[PDB]
Motif scaffolding. Structure first.
Motif, PDB file in Angstrom:
ATOM      1  N   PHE D   1      62.120  34.284  23.190  1.00 50.22           N
ATOM      2  CA  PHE D   1      62.366  35.313  24.189  1.00 50.22           C
ATOM      3  C   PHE D   1      63.618  36.126  23.908  1.00 50.22           C
ATOM      4  N   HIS D   2      64.713  35.443  23.502  1.00 50.03           N
ATOM      5  CA  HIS D   2      65.957  36.060  23.082  1.00 50.03           C
ATOM      6  C   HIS D   2      65.776  37.008  21.912  1.00 50.03           C
ATOM      7  N   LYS D   3      65.055  36.568  20.859  1.00 46.01           N
ATOM      8  CA  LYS D   3      64.731  37.405  19.726  1.00 46.01           C
ATOM      9  C   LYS D   3      63.894  38.627  20.094  1.00 46.01           C
ATOM     10  N   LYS D   4      62.873  38.444  20.951  1.00 40.38           N
ATOM     11  CA  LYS D   4      62.027  39.535  21.389  1.00 40.38           C
ATOM     12  C   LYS D   4      62.743  40.641  22.161  1.00 40.38           C
ATOM     13  N   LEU D   5      63.711  40.252  23.017  1.00 39.63           N
ATOM     14  CA  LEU D   5      64.639  41.149  23.679  1.00 39.63           C
ATOM     15  C   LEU D   5      65.600  41.853  22.732  1.00 39.63           C
ATOM     16  N   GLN D   6      66.205  41.114  21.772  1.00 42.57           N
ATOM     17  CA  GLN D   6      67.131  41.645  20.783  1.00 42.57           C
ATOM     18  C   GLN D   6      66.504  42.694  19.865  1.00 42.57           C
ATOM     19  N   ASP D   7      65.238  42.441  19.458  1.00 47.92           N
ATOM     20  CA  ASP D   7      64.454  43.300  18.601  1.00 47.92           C
ATOM     21  C   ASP D   7      63.868  44.499  19.382  1.00 47.92           C
ATOM     22  N   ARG D   8      64.053  44.571  20.732  1.00 47.11           N
ATOM     23  CA  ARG D   8      63.605  45.654  21.610  1.00 47.11           C
ATOM     24  C   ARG D   8      62.086  45.788  21.674  1.00 47.11           C
ATOM     25  N   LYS D   9      61.372  44.648  21.728  1.00 48.10           N
ATOM     26  CA  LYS D   9      59.922  44.605  21.669  1.00 48.10           C
ATOM     27  C   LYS D   9      59.400  43.760  22.798  1.00 48.10           C
ATOM     28  N   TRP D  10      60.087  43.807  23.952  1.00 48.11           N
ATOM     29  CA  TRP D  10      59.674  43.147  25.168  1.00 48.11           C
ATOM     30  C   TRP D  10      58.399  43.729  25.756  1.00 48.11           C
ATOM     31  N   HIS D  11      57.464  42.856  26.148  1.00 46.18           N
ATOM     32  CA  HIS D  11      56.312  43.241  26.921  1.00 46.18           C
ATOM     33  C   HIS D  11      56.453  42.449  28.176  1.00 46.18           C
ATOM     34  N   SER D  12      56.465  43.125  29.337  1.00 45.25           N
ATOM     35  CA  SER D  12      56.508  42.479  30.638  1.00 45.25           C
ATOM     36  C   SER D  12      55.324  41.574  30.883  1.00 45.25           C
ATOM     37  N   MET D  13      55.546  40.450  31.588  1.00 49.39           N
ATOM     38  CA  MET D  13      54.496  39.585  32.095  1.00 49.39           C
ATOM     39  C   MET D  13      53.526  40.317  32.998  1.00 49.39           C
ATOM     40  N   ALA D  14      52.268  39.867  33.043  1.00 51.32           N
ATOM     41  CA  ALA D  14      51.292  40.480  33.899  1.00 51.32           C
ATOM     42  C   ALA D  14      50.653  39.408  34.743  1.00 51.32           C
ATOM     43  N   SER D  15      50.256  39.778  35.978  1.00 52.90           N
ATOM     44  CA  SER D  15      49.405  38.976  36.844  1.00 52.90           C
ATOM     45  C   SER D  15      48.002  39.064  36.303  1.00 52.90           C
ATOM     46  N   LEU D  16      47.471  37.931  35.826  1.00 53.98           N
ATOM     47  CA  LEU D  16      46.148  37.863  35.265  1.00 53.98           C
ATOM     48  C   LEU D  16      45.196  37.194  36.221  1.00 53.98           C
ATOM     49  N   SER D  17      43.895  37.437  36.042  1.00 51.49           N
ATOM     50  CA  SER D  17      42.902  36.806  36.877  1.00 51.49           C
ATOM     51  C   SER D  17      41.864  36.222  35.967  1.00 51.49           C
ATOM     52  N   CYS D  18      41.403  34.994  36.261  1.00 52.73           N
ATOM     53  CA  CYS D  18      40.351  34.333  35.515  1.00 52.73           C
ATOM     54  C   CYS D  18      39.037  34.491  36.245  1.00 52.73           C
ATOM     55  N   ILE D  19      37.916  34.651  35.501  1.00 49.27           N
ATOM     56  CA  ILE D  19      36.560  34.659  36.059  1.00 49.27           C
ATOM     57  C   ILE D  19      36.334  35.761  37.104  1.00 49.27           C
ATOM     58  N   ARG D  20      36.746  36.994  36.784  1.00 48.61           N
ATOM     59  CA  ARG D  20      36.593  38.137  37.627  1.00 48.61           C
ATOM     60  C   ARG D  20      35.963  39.175  36.755  1.00 48.61           C
ATOM     61  N   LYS D  21      35.400  40.208  37.389  1.00 47.54           N
ATOM     62  CA  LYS D  21      34.683  41.273  36.732  1.00 47.54           C
ATOM     63  C   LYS D  21      35.487  42.057  35.692  1.00 47.54           C
ATOM     64  N   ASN D  22      36.782  42.276  36.002  1.00 48.25           N
ATOM     65  CA  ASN D  22      37.718  42.992  35.163  1.00 48.25           C
ATOM     66  C   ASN D  22      38.855  42.088  34.743  1.00 48.25           C
ATOM     67  N   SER D  23      38.618  40.767  34.568  1.00 50.70           N
ATOM     68  CA  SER D  23      39.561  39.897  33.869  1.00 50.70           C
ATOM     69  C   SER D  23      39.925  40.430  32.494  1.00 50.70           C
ATOM     70  N   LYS D  24      41.221  40.499  32.157  1.00 51.27           N
ATOM     71  CA  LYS D  24      41.666  41.099  30.924  1.00 51.27           C
ATOM     72  C   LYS D  24      42.802  40.251  30.424  1.00 51.27           C
ATOM     73  N   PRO D  25      42.974  40.069  29.123  1.00 49.88           N
ATOM     74  CA  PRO D  25      44.081  39.312  28.581  1.00 49.88           C
ATOM     75  C   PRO D  25      45.410  40.008  28.741  1.00 49.88           C
ATOM     76  N   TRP D  26      46.504  39.235  28.619  1.00 51.07           N
ATOM     77  CA  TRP D  26      47.840  39.767  28.567  1.00 51.07           C
ATOM     78  C   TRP D  26      48.074  40.599  27.307  1.00 51.07           C
ATOM     79  N   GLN D  27      48.445  41.886  27.464  1.00 52.49           N
ATOM     80  CA  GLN D  27      48.658  42.800  26.358  1.00 52.49           C
ATOM     81  C   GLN D  27      49.867  42.432  25.493  1.00 52.49           C
ATOM     82  N   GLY D  28      50.863  41.735  26.091  1.00 57.16           N
ATOM     83  CA  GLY D  28      52.029  41.241  25.377  1.00 57.16           C
ATOM     84  C   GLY D  28      51.806  39.965  24.621  1.00 57.16           C
ATOM     85  N   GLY D  29      50.610  39.361  24.742  1.00 54.20           N
ATOM     86  CA  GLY D  29      50.369  38.004  24.293  1.00 54.20           C
ATOM     87  C   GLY D  29      50.351  37.805  22.817  1.00 54.20           C
TER      88      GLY D  29
END
Lengths: 126, 62, 126, 62
Positions: D1-29
């Motif tokens: 996490f420290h390295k990802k912040l230092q390198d300026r390549k942070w992706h914010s966490m997302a609220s995800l949903s499982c087993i829903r019509k528009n369930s989508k993976p985390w884009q930062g993952g």
């Protein structure tokens, strides 16, 4: 109008199980003695039987449509996840264990949590 | 299902949701499971039925 | 405000794993050299490790809260279901295999589907 | 996490949903997984790191 709807979850290798399942529904819907005024309808989904999350997700979609029972023909990998889902949702689960590649069956040994009522009926013998 | 409809004990199917805040089991499920569990039919395997443990007991090897 | 949040799923037998997990977060949040301006927060859930549907459901609730990574300390029974969930949701999964009752570890022999990218990192050695 | 912040390549966490019509993976993952995978720390086990196969290679028996 249909009030009798059942769900089925098959492994990708279980195309013959789907063919026989559909034929059996056909044969019963031609039988005037059993379910005299009601036709059986169904929803079938094929899943990767080595993906337990996919098996749960697709079984949950069938339960959203509305089913009286869930039939599965699948190996041990996703069997534990389907059994625990059936226990949570109170959906009767008719489990047909498939062996991998015609290997001799062994017991799944899933050791399903026994605190809750078991909604799974194991169709194949011990 | 035929026995449940001929004994006036039908519970309609419900649209269920998994992993939601108000996910709830099917209210007809316990009575349906017990009706299926004590069922028995003559079919392509011979006799299909379930023991107390929820498993089919019947098998023959040649 | 906190932007660093991690999730953890523990077996019911893994109370010591939770204690050490919380202590480790404490120790890092006292370290001024690593994450100089950001505190680590977390959400922990205990599950029956023989219930794979419960493990998936509770891991999904943690993902709804919003996590950067999922730590698990659990046996092989629910490991396959968590790994396949992590692969579907793109959540980095740090998997710590627990043995049952201090028995020697064996491989989980998971046969996890290799069509999709593996989001699981196995923390314990082979 | 420290390295990802230092390198300026942070992706914010997302609220995800499982087993829903528009369930989508985390884009930062994907970027987070790769950053964690090539991480390495000296800790209580000795050295914790991951090989190409995603597993820790390090072990010692006495």
């Amino acid at each position: 109008d249909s009030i009798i709807h059942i769900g089925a979850i098959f492994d990708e290798s279980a195309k013959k199980d789907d063919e026989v399942f559909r034929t059996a529904v056909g044969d019963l819907n031609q039988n005037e003695e059993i379910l005299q005024t009601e036709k059986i309808t169904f929803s079938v989904t094929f899943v990767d039987g080595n993906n337990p999350f996919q098996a749960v997700q697709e079984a949950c979609e069938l339960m959203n449509q509305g089913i009286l029972a869930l039939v599965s023909s699948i190996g041990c990998t996703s069997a534990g996840s389907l059994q625990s889902l059936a226990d949570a949702m109170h959906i009767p689960h008719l489990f047909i264990q498939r062996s991998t590649a015609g290997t001799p069956r062994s017991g799944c040994g899933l050791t399903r949590s026994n605190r809750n009522d078991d909604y799974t009926l194991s169709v194949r013998p011990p | 299902f035929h026995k449940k409809l001929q004994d006036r004990k039908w519970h309609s199917m419900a649209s269920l949701s998994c992993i939601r805040k108000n996910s709830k089991p099917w209210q007809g499920g316990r009575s349906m499971l017990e009706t299926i569990k004590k069922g028995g039919v003559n079919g392509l395997t011979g006799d299909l039925e379930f023991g107390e443990n929820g498993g089919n007991p019947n098998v023959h090897f040649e």
